[PDB]
């Protein structure tokens, strides 16, 4: 009986492949070979945010484009004023193994987690004047790879147990459990409309999920190795994945397949972060070759390079106002570029 | 800056001060990962070490032997990304074993990991009394051209076993600090301390070019 279901799955996979081929009439490169080159984009280090005692694993911006949260193997979570290189806060964590950080879209909360299995949500706005653990969301079996906020009351997480989860913060229960990955889920990104989100998961696949339904809407593949980064094109109908095979890629949700692949022959190093600029013309990819490259997102060309980290660029993020790009590396330095 | 930014800068300077305090505390703290299928050996060594130097998932252990902060992590391809500020790896392997194949497969996996390239490796061999007990009633492993001496004195058996963990290593120049371990704990702590010290000396000199 099992062979029947397996063969039906194979037939459906063939239908999916054929339908994706049938829509691939022309590529983004054949359409943008006539558009103006983005040029020699070389922006500088404006701020060098230093103070962490070890490697930074995650950074996240505020919606105000000024405040910045960073989680480090120190067991610390520092909130910085990017304009002035001030430390707004230092949050000591119960576990030194923090892999992700989030900054609430309203600025009230931050989040962290890691090999401690538990998603820790911190309240910044207390009359007691201290950041305190507002909740410890429990329910994951492995490490917490990335955590993202929708509003102040609910948060989406992904773990190293092949499982994502939409938590209601007040009650601490998984209001929805997103299952379907076959590997460790590493990086997830939310749509700006905050109704869909995608997950990348060390199984050569990323998935578009609906948050209000709990079902995996679409399954994208094409990578040969672990999708270690993900981010939406800033309108919610394209995203880009970086992976240990040293290749970024751009997927369109409506076309359900790739559009343009960003790989250079001299880059044999893995990809640790991906982000888009405000308009989506620039694609920033942090690499393990101690570097971060800037891609013309519509031509697969290299616009430029943010050289200037002394070890792996583990995180990067672009402000909501577009002014700055902030990169965090395992050299304890977080740098603002504009 | 004016009248609120000066105060914010004072706050940030205080946070920098606290972070520098903890860097002073941390940069002295050396990490020794623990691995191996000998869970009982892991527990026994942990208990003895904490008894001397104190007086689920990952199970950290903090103590201080000779004024030197040890963090025995006691743990997988993603976990090890977080573990390259480490100064050694221990394997708890029971000398009385088959289980030697299993242990050396695990050691082969761990020993050559790229993230652990600059990490010295200590192979803690456990229950050597049980090893001589199984030498008296010879347990013969006949799957390698090393049975020559197998039904003989314990020393040949130990040499074969220690080679078996020397076997399956592909990144040498940082030697395996093999020990033959018993129930006395002071010598165990001494082994750990001496191995970590030699590792740091060699790294300092090699990176200072002698």
């Amino acid at each position: 009986e099992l062979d029947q279901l397996r063969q039906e799955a194979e037939q459906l996979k063939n239908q999916i492949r054929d339908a994706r081929k049938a829509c691939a009439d022309a590529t983004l490169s054949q359409i943008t070979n006539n558009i103006d080159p983005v040029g020699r984009i070389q922006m500088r280090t404006r701020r060098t945010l230093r103070g962490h005692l070890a490697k930074i694993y995650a950074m996240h911006w505020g919606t105000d484009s000024r405040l910045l949260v960073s989680a480090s193997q120190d067991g610390k979570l520092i909130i910085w004023d990017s304009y002035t290189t001030n430390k707004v806060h230092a949050i000591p964590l119960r576990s030194s193994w923090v892999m992700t950080c989030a900054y609430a879209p309203s600025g009230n909360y931050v989040a962290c987690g890691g090999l401690d299995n538990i998603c820790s949500i911190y309240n910044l706005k207390t009359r007691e004047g201290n950041v305190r653990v507002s909740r410890e969301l429990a329910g994951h079996t492995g490490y917490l790879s990335c955590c993202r906020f929708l509003d102040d009351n609910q948060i989406v997480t992904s773990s190293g147990d092949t499982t994502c989860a939409l938590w209601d913060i007040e009650t601490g229960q998984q209001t929805t459990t997103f299952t379907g990955h076959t590997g460790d889920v590493m990086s997830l990104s939310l749509a700006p409309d905050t109704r869909l989100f995608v997950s990348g998961a060390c199984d050569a696949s990323a998935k578009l999920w609906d948050v209000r339904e709990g079902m995996c809407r679409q399954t994208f593949t094409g990578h040969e190795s672990d999708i270690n980064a993900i981010c939406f094109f800033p309108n919610g109908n394209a995203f880009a994945t970086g992976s240990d095979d040293a290749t970024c890629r751009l997927f369109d949700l409506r076309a359900d397949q790739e559009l343009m692949t960003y790989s250079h022959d001299n880059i044999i190093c893995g990809i640790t972060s991906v982000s888009f600029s405000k308009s989506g013309r620039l694609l920033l990819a942090g690499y393990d070759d101690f570097n971060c490259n800037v891609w013309d997102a519509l031509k697969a060309d290299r616009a430029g390079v943010l050289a200037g980290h002394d070890n792996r660029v583990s995180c990067l993020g672009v402000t909501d106002d577009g002014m700055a790009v902030a990169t965090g590396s395992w050299d304890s330095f977080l740098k603002i570029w504009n | 800056l004016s009248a609120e930014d000066k105060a914010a800068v004072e706050r940030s300077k205080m946070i920098d001060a606290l972070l520098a305090r903890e860097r002073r505390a941390v940069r002295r703290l050396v990490k020794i990962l623990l691995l191996g299928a000998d869970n009982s050996g892991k527990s026994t060594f942990l208990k003895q070490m904490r008894i001397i130097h104190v007086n689920k998932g990952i199970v950290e252990h903090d103590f201080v032997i000779k004024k030197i902060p040890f963090k025995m992590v006691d743990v997988r391809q993603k976990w090890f990304q977080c573990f390259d500020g480490i100064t050694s790896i221990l394997f708890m392997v029971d000398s009385s074993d088959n289980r030697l194949v299993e242990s050396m497969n695990d050691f082969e996996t761990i020993v050559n990991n790229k993230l652990f390239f600059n990490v010295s490796i200590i192979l803690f061999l456990n229950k050597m009394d049980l090893l001589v007990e199984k030498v008296k009633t010879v347990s013969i492993k006949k799957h390698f051209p090393d049975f020559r001496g197998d039904p003989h004195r314990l020393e040949d058996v130990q040499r074969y076993l220690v080679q078996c963990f020397d076997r399956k290593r592909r990144n040498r120049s940082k030697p395996l600090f093999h020990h033959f371990t018993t129930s006395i704990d002071t010598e165990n702590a001494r082994f750990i301390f001496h191995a970590v010290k030699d590792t740091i000396l060699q790294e300092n000199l090699k990176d200072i070019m002698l």
Epitope: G129, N130 | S2, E4, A7, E10, R11
Partner: single-chain antibody
């Protein structure tokens, strides 16, 4: 949160006194502390300030080297050592919490205060001492600034405070535009450098009282006379 102040009473002219402030329910060592005066029938004046970490200390012109502010963090106590008091020091003193990071709300919690009886600077002018008002109608108050409060940072460091009859002041607007936590949203404020106005839609009972304006552009902090809203 709670700041219970102790040390009041009657002092003969001259002499010395030591006001203490017991903080309870918040992380004292992360906060700045201000000492704020209020004359028996008058507006409220600023006195002194100690920072988080006791790093910096600021005073008014009438108390410099005459008063000393200190904090003992482990016991959660703020001290004001008053030396050589005069008949003009007769006032109610309040301990005013403050915190300074991007987006913080300084001057947020004001203590119950202690009564002490003794037997250039940015000028801010209150438009009028009192206003006839009626519940349900929107009202406006104003002060004038002798010096543009819009610092180059873009923030206009101006504060509006409310003291109900017989109670301790409550922050109402910080930096000329933002509302404090616990304040109804019917309060709002606006203005620019050298003139600013507070607007209330649907003033009700318990909105009676005195509205004060402070500058925080540069110590010393100077206060207006405050307008009284009377039903």
């Amino acid at each position: 949160v709670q700041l219970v102040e102790s040390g009041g009473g009657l002092v003969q002219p001259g002499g010395s006194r030591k006001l203490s402030c017991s903080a309870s329910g918040f992380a004292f060592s992360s906060f700045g502390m201000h000492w704020v005066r209020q004359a028996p029938e008058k507006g409220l004046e600023w006195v002194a300030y100690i920072s988080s970490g006791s790093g910096t200390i600021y005073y008014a012109d009438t108390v410099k080297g005459r008063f000393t502010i200190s904090r003992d963090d482990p016991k959660n106590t703020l001290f004001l050592q008053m030396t050589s008091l005069r008949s003009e020091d007769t006032a109610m003193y309040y301990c005013v919490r403050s915190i300074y990071y991007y987006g913080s709300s300084p001057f947020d919690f004001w203590g119950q205060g202690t009564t002490l009886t003794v037997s250039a600077d940015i000028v801010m002018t209150q438009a009028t001492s009192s206003v006839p008002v009626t519940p349900g109608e929107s009202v406006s108050i104003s002060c004038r600034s002798s010096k543009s409060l819009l610092h180059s940072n873009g923030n206009t460091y101006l504060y509006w405070f409310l003291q109900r009859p017989g109670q301790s002041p409550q922050l109402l607007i910080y930096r000329m535009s933002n509302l404090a936590s616990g304040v109804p949203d019917r309060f709002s404020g606006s203005g620019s450098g050298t003139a600013f106005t507070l607007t209330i839609s649907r003033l009700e009972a318990e909105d009676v009282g005195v509205y004060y304006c402070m500058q925080h552009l540069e110590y010393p902090l100077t206060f207006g006379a405050g307008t009284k809203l009377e039903l």
